[model samples]
Target: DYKAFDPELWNAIDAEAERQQNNIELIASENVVSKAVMAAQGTLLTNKSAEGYPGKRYYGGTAVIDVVETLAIERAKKLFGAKFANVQPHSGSQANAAVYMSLIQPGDTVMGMDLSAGGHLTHGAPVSFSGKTYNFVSYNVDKESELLDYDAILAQAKEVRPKLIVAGASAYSRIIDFAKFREIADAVGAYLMVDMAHIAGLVASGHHPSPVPYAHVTTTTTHKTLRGPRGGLILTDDEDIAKKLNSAVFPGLQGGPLEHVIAAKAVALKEALDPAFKEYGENVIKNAAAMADVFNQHPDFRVISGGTNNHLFLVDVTKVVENGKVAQNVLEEVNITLNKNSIPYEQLSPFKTSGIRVGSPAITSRGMGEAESRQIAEWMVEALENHDKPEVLERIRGDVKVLTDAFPLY
Candidate 1:
């Protein structure tokens, strides 16, 4: 694909992707893609320079670009059972940015979940652009439940009367109550935006509840559980909102759509419509449950919310180690990849958080099932239990390689 670029650089990237594919990936927000999807993403579609949506491009040579994007739109809408789909947003962050641009004005009042307590940065963390320009208020999970405080959220909505309320998170481990959030948004006369980025594939397969019926707008990444190329998508059941979203993503945000990625999105959306994809989604959740069950049995660990209802969980590493930073570093030494995160009401700072976020979607997508999940969870416990012992991590690394080798990504 890189006709004139250095072959060495391409070879290095290819080798790196292969190495990652051979490893056990537990990151909640990452997944493997099908070969067909990979093919489309590496197609000549990248050569196109279409600057607008189908049937309304400012530049020429958009005929094929129209087909690629429209197929992505149609397939995505069909897969998600939504009325509209915008396939142009560059990433999930950009999708959320587009929604913010469309619905709320600059410095408008907005409410989202707190980042440490199951929220995304785009939902108004101070350092993020979304928070900087908007008058952002935040709600958090209950101290006892480690789950969203719906009653408190409703009370906050009533008090703040925000113009927009975002419902979603990157590290949250429970199912979101979109209807209740919608009710709170309605009570405050606010628009509701659900960022289903983490569970789009689960929703598509009916493993998780759909956000389409509850929110005025919804955004998701094509990669996460959806298992597409790295990209973003926006959806809505409202026609006016759809048009506004298109405007927001195009002239309001990006200039040209990545047609190659759109092609991959179409391929992934079609795969998601398959019956086997449903089973895959179910396995993702099942693997997560198995991991959580194992963690809960360990004395050194605390599985937040007691367990999980979806693909990921927050493990309170502070109980075992001083903080999540140390736990994460120790785990990486064993080639077991997970992220340091903040537990709800965590006393530790974000950089050196109290929790570690773990998930099974990626490993499940690579064909690891319940048995492999159990083994991996056991390895996690052992590694954390003897983090100071190099032999413990060495043993865990051997097990990870054995399991990953058995279920290699195609």
Candidate 2:
């Protein structure tokens, strides 16, 4: 449509749309945003830079921007059951950085989930700014169950006496016990933080337990399970933590707020608040479990932790192909897309992982249930099994096209 207007940029954008429509996006951290969310981001709000929160801005043309920002903050607070919400941080990483700035000192010892145990880079991988600034102590899931070992965490917390204890993971498939995390932090006289970046939608829809009550602060990305524009949110029940985080987000970290993204987040929060979102959250869990069950049918495929209770699960794809890298590449050849992930007790280097992470959020967003979920899982296995067989690969590609055509993305 925009071929003559701007061939270079518009053609790339068009290609991305077609790619998303055709491919089965199984990346655990990605989800499709609603048309409403996209429209809000494209609004005139992007023109004005609101440098501060409601009723307080460094810029003069913030009268309307203040209303938009307050709506975003209020919607987030209501959705997450927080007394205060800061919807200004540009990304989830920025949100984590802001919360750290609010509560801890530089070089202070803090506990976080280890990256190998499904934790995020912002939680303290040495390569990240978080690890460079703080003395990050890594925790892990139990070797046997590959689940969070609360007792071990408490023991480490007591011995280390960290200033803060961070809970949550990017790839964990089970429910997190925020109360237990709070108990551990209490024993160490430390503040508790929960980065619910991946499960914010479930928590909002009441499918998962809320961390707002048990945690001193909570952080999330609006784009993942929440199905919003790309932005960050911080929630806290404490007025003190709220104020510190607000300042930390504004002058301390980012200079100006993207009012456009804030508006889009507000739209998503409102969408999540509806009863229909609860049904969506339920289907997300169901579809993920269904797919995991299909993966388990194979003797060599090991679904991480046996199965999943949430929207994503990890599978050791080594036996199916050579490794996670091979499985990911072979599957993508037929238009299926998932990411290679480091499993707990990973045997291979980060460059070649042992497992692939699969998620149901994007498919669920497109309104597919358990039946379609199973079909996609079966297709993934078929593709991996026949990676080198041209005849079989052609048939799977044709089937994928038929299925994707049935479920329209736009």
Candidate 3:
């Protein structure tokens, strides 16, 4: 269909579509957006430069763009039960940066989950700008239970006396206790910021607790479980913090907002408000649990935190193979995709981690349920066990295509 336009670029796009159709994407951070959402993002709104908020743009011809941005903001606020929502951030990391800019100073201390223990880089990894700019104190899950230790976090917060305390995770498998985090932050006289990027859809659907009530500020990616275009959202209940966030996102960090992506976010937020989306959120967790059940069948494979309470989980794959990197590569050859991750108290380096993080959002979007999830897990074990066998990998690749084709993406 794209034979008339740039054939080279069209070919790459075509290949990517085919790849998506053929592969089972288990990466925890990825999800498939609807065609309507894609259409919204591909609009002429991308041509306009709306350099400020609705009704206050530096550019002249922003009447329509203002409508789009306002719709996105209102929809996001309603969906997440927040008094205010800023839909201008380019990505989740940018949303976090703007949040930090609004509330905390460069030298002020802050606390977040440690990278090796399921936290995102923007949540204060030493290599990230968040760590370099702020005095970031790292926290971790309990070593034995592999879950957030509220008491330990309280002790750490008291010692650090951070200006901001971040609550959330990128690879955690259990539900977060926002109320508990709020208690700790309150005791330390610190502001609580929740990054619900990974589970925004679940939170919107009432499957997970909304952080807007407990947090002074909240941030999320519009794409990841929200299933929208790639963008970021900042939500708050406080008018004071809301104003600062708006400025931080606009002249403070970015210049013009992506009106097209904003329009797509509005579409996605509207979809989340639908009753069917709640079922989708439920099935995402159900499917992840099914896959975890399959992983537990192997003596060597251990599901971190015992099992998942959300849409993703980490598995100790070292017993099945050398490490996560090898299992990731081997699974890729058979068109199965997941990412290498570090488990709590991990002994391996980041490059050769002992675990793989898997999720069901993408497959769940394609109508997969518990049975299909288990079958996919079985195939994953088969491929990993026969990594060096070309024939075995080929057989599983064909089987994967059959399953993917049955559940066509687009």
Candidate 4:
């Protein structure tokens, strides 16, 4: 139908699919979703506007919509062991926005991880609404271990006396200690909020610790490691806080629910609840650890935090090249795609960061295992080391094509 009605757009979409098919995607925050998730998005649900919660819509003709959304909400709650779940936030940022609105007032003190230390934009980057709205102070990982230091965080929290403490990150490779975060918040009589967007898949499969028990409100994306369509979800165990979060997500932040994406989220959540997903989650961590081991063995490359326990890790690419951006472009040439990330205590401008973030989610989703992950890391190192050599890059690109062909998306 798209090919018939919109040839130009269809052509571009077709080309993009082929492009993805030809490369190895190592991006930390991306995943190849299931066919079901993709199909769910282009349904008749898109034609309707589900403007509020189930049985409480501000509009009519929402009987089917309410059932679909309620299913998603129930699945989300079951997947995360949450008492309440809101699956309407259009994105992780939007979810964070609503939670912030629901919890603390503007100009109130809040604590979040520092951006340069692997935190996300919505967690209080100066340019984000969070920082502009709240008085956001930040904490960084230990200078030597490159991991969170709870005692130090508690020390800072005591001094800041923040109204809310945000946990989690976009680039960190280690397991987060939400219990400690909760304790620190308790010490200061503050609320704990965790954005578990990156590790939701791992948590769902018992590969990582769940933050639902410790955090006052937990927010996540349905995509990324969750292998769903792009959308946001909020979960809370507290009933009063859940009510506030729903109100904030509805009238405070958005108009109607994106039922199409919500439906897609529902399918994805159901897929995660399957037994096979646990095996998939296990493979994800194994593949990432394998890649990290290879990177660490490379004398020039330093794996940040020594190694990874999750699905992603950061490696300092500066020793092989001048900057991470250079390595990023170089890898792209060889059909391996990953993003440049700022290292802990980064010395360069954000435009030219000192490291590359490598993850196993997408590649694992494509069915690549530890053996392939190690080889891919070696290929990455080889390409970066011989960046100026056209012959080496050409050969690597050809090899990458073969590997991708063996693990086709569809």
Tens-digit per-residue lDDT, 1-410, candidate 3: 64877889888889999998888999988999999999999999889999989888897978988888889988988888899999999999999999999999998999999888878999987888999999888889999999999999999899889999998888999999999999999999999999999999889878888888999999999988888899899999999999999999989999988888899999999999999999999999999999999988788689999999899999999977998999899999999999998899889988999999999999999999999999999999899888888999999999988899899998
User: Lowest-lDDT window of 10 residues in candidate 4?
Assistant: 1-10
Best by TM-score: 4
Model 1: lowest-lDDT 10 consecutive positions: 1-10
lDDT of 3 at 136: 88
C-alpha RMSD by candidate, in order? 1.6, 1.1, 1.1, 0.8
Error of 1 at 109 (Å): 0.6
Q: Candidate 2, residues 351-389: lDDT per residue as tens digits?
A: 889999999999999889999999999998888888999
Error of 1 at 126 (Å): 1.7
What TM-score, computed on C-alpha atoms, does each candidate reach? 0.97, 0.98, 0.98, 0.99
lDDT, each prediction: 0.89, 0.91, 0.92, 0.94
The digit string of per-residue lDDT tens for model 1 on 300-370 reads 78898999999999999776788898988888887778889888888988789989999988899888889
Clashes of each: 0, 0, 0, 0
Clashing pairs in 1: none
Best by lDDT: 4
